[PDB]
Symmetry: C3
Subunit: 146 residues, 3 copies
């Protein structure tokens, strides 16, 4: 974990974000149970009957939050890991990881909590900024070593 000074901070933030995705998965399951809205007939038949194989807006919302996480957090897992080894300024790297962590936690709160627009959109944008920054830095480092 001490292979680079920024690595511990990266691993802390990334792992917290993975756990945060698992929290969304757990919430999704609980909403399915509460609202009796199952994706599969085999699930529905165990939990009240075939009529409960149905869509639900809250389930769909949970799935959107989880999908958006997959569209954003998974790239961060890659970019942040590589970036940790490019010798960035420790504080600067910290700030990249923290902005992503805070932005993404806020995104899930804004999504699942149905907060007014443009709160969710702003949190998404905030979090994407350090990702764009790391991506460009990796490009320069990779290109110059070709």
């Amino acid at each position: 974990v001490m292979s680079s000074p920024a690595l511990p901070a990266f691993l802390l933030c990334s792992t917290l974000l993975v756990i945060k995705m698992y929290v969304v998965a757990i919430i999704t399951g609980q909403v399915r149970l509460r609202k009796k809205a199952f994706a599969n007939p085999e699930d529905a038949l165990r939990h009240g009957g075939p009529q409960y194989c149905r869509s639900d807006p809250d389930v769909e919302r949970c799935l959107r939050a989880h999908r958006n996480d997959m569209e954003t957090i998974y790239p961060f897992l890659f970019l942040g890991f590589v970036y940790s080894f490019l010798g960035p300024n420790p504080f600067v790297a910290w700030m990249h990881f923290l902005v992503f962590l805070v932005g993404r936690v806020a995104h899930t709160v804004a999504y699942l909590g149905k907060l007014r627009a443009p709160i969710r959109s702003v949190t998404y944008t905030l979090a994407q900024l350090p990702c764009a920054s790391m991506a460009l830095q990796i490009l320069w480092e990779a290109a110059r070593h070709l």
Copy 2:
């Protein structure tokens, strides 16, 4: 690959799971062809006409299995890789990877095979357990190096 004693086992299990996801992708395509259920008008027009741009429950099921894989296997690729470098007991690490591999293969069989509830849900839970375990271990290691 010998950068850590647990790494070969991790790389074997992870790569098998990636191949298992590709198998789901291949099955999905075959179901689309068999059931004539295409997502795109350009596909449908090559394969019988515009009426074949349509949803199908078996195609949707394949997509759910693939999506669930993305929600679970992708985090494992990250967590398991990092965990391999934290000096875990070789046998203990093996067990983490094997439980995930077996649980996830069983999950796909239970999903695509339409096995009775709660078989699929149990396989998902089984496989998530070693992921939660690795995530916590990474948190402790990262935090203590800050």
Copy 3:
């Protein structure tokens, strides 16, 4: 970045592909705005009224392209990284990464541009070939170190 001769090429191609996924995300948002097709009532109410919380075929197409990217590019991020450290022939490794990069960029163009079948399907197949190749190579290396 010089931990292995193939690594710079891998990091260049992978990071470009992550940026290419972000481009799809940006396009998706712009299509939502242009076509007034929002996934969430809170978005719709800021942008003209509740009737604009609705699906749209172009938005759905963008989401399919992005999802297909998640089904294919994310595995490449893992496989290509590991493969970079297995001492492959530099030119051979380059070719694996370039075929994936070109195939995937072409895939997005074919998907979003609604090009005739089987153009998109062929680009997908082309790009999967080096992934299958790397996966098998990782399997052999991992297995022989057990």
